[PDB]
Amino acid sequence: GPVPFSHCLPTEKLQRCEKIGEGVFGEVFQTIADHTPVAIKIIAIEGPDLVNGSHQKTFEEILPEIIISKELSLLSGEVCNRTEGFIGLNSVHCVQGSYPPLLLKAWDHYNSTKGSANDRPDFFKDDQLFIVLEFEFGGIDLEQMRTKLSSLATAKSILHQLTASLAVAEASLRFEHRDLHWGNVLLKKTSLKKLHYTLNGKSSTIPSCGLQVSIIDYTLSRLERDGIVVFCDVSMDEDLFTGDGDYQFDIYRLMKKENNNRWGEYHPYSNVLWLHYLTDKMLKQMTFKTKCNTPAMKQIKRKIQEFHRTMLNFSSATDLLCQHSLFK
Numbered sequence: 001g002p003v004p005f006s007h008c009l010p011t012e013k014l015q016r017c018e019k020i021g022e023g024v025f026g027e028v029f030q031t032i033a034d035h036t037p038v039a040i041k042i043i044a045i046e047g048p049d050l051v052n053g054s055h056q057k058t059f060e061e062i063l064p065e066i067i068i069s070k071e072l073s074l075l076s077g078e079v080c081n082r083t084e085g086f087i088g089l090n091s092v093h094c095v096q097g098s099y100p101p102l103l104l105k106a107w108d109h110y111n112s113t114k115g116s117a118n119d120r121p122d123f124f125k126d127d128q129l130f131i132v133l134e135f136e137f138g139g140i141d142l143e144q145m146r147t148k149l150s151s152l153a154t155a156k157s158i159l160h161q162l163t164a165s166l167a168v169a170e171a172s173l174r175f176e177h178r179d180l181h182w183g184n185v186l187l188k189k190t191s192l193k194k195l196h197y198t199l200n201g202k203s204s205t206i207p208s209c210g211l212q213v214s215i216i217d218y219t220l221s222r223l224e225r226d227g228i229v230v231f232c233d234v235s236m237d238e239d240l241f242t243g244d245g246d247y248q249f250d251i252y253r254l255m256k257k258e259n260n261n262r263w264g265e266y267h268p269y270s271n272v273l274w275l276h277y278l279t280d281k282m283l284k285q286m287t288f289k290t291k292c293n294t295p296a297m298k299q300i301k302r303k304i305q306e307f308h309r310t311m312l313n314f315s316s317a318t319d320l321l322c323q324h325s326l327f328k
């Protein structure tokens with residue numbers, strides 16, 4: 001059954017861990033595996049203690065995230081519906097133990113520097129189970145990059161990449177993300193001038209503006225293969241739908257309105273709602289190195305604003321990608 005933490009995180013690997021993010025789910029650490037950067041997401045399961053305000057998931061409840069992360073990681077090697085826009089998943093393990101002191105040290109450093117909304121994970125007993133998901137290191141989330149983009153042209157590339165990635169996943173898997181807040185959009189520098197994707201056998205390119213965008217976090221996602229749906233049933237989760245202070249929290253209520261609290265159903269419009277949320281972040285909450293001040297540039301901005309006010313009349317990411325003027 002489960003392996004000890006040291007199977008996954010031997011000493012040199014633990015010593016190189018730096019905490020890079022968190023959520024109610026648990027903790028994310030960056031480290032190195034065989035000279036390669038990775039991101040490790042650690043989720044406590046099956047235990048009785050409250051963790052970060054919630055009871056722990058069971059194996060059955062964590063399985064949908066695991067399945068979808070795997071299925072989406074495969075899209076980079078497919079052919080008819082191919083994209084590198086979703087994070088690569090390297091491995092999944094079930095680990096048993098108390099939290100490693102070295103992870104706690106990394107946890108403390110993050111709390112001392114950025115502040116944490118989580119419980120310090122020091123109360124777990126030596127029989128505690130965790131799921132440990134090791135992903136490719138995808139770069140820095142859009143939220144943390146909100147002051148770091150070159151200009152609105154970069155924003156355009158980012159929106160195009162996200163729309164293409166979601167379209168490819170809609171086509172292949174009838175995928176909805178359902179939680180694509182700006183912490184879940186990663187950016188990494190790339191030397192490639194053009195990025196490629198293939199949608200239903202047709203290959204296209206997108207100018208990178210020097211960034212490759214990776215989508216992460218399938219805790220609320222839904223997809224289906226051969227009529228078997230894998231999803232998060234949030235029909236009894238009342239708190240998901242009472243958040244405030246950010247447009248993000250409206251999106252959950254809107255999704256619920258549009259699917260009648262039936263989470264198994266396919267409503268690809270939910271990908272449009274998140275894209276609209278993201279476009280808003282780009283227009284309101286980002287500062288750019290190059291400004292709102294040349295003709296070529298002001299035109300790009302006018303196009304992003306026109307996209308913002310018209311995108312909600314498209315039925316899916318595929319519909320936006322294929323029919324919206326922003327991408328023509």
Ligand SMILES: Nc1ncnc2c1c(I)cn2[C@@H]1O[C@H](CO)[C@@H](O)[C@H]1O
Nearest residue numbers: 021022028039135137138139141183
């Ligand atoms: N694979 C990755 N590469 C780089 N950063 C990652 C990941 C993953 I999984 C998560 N994160 C960072 O941790 C925060 C919480 O999920 C995210 O918002 C993000 O800051």
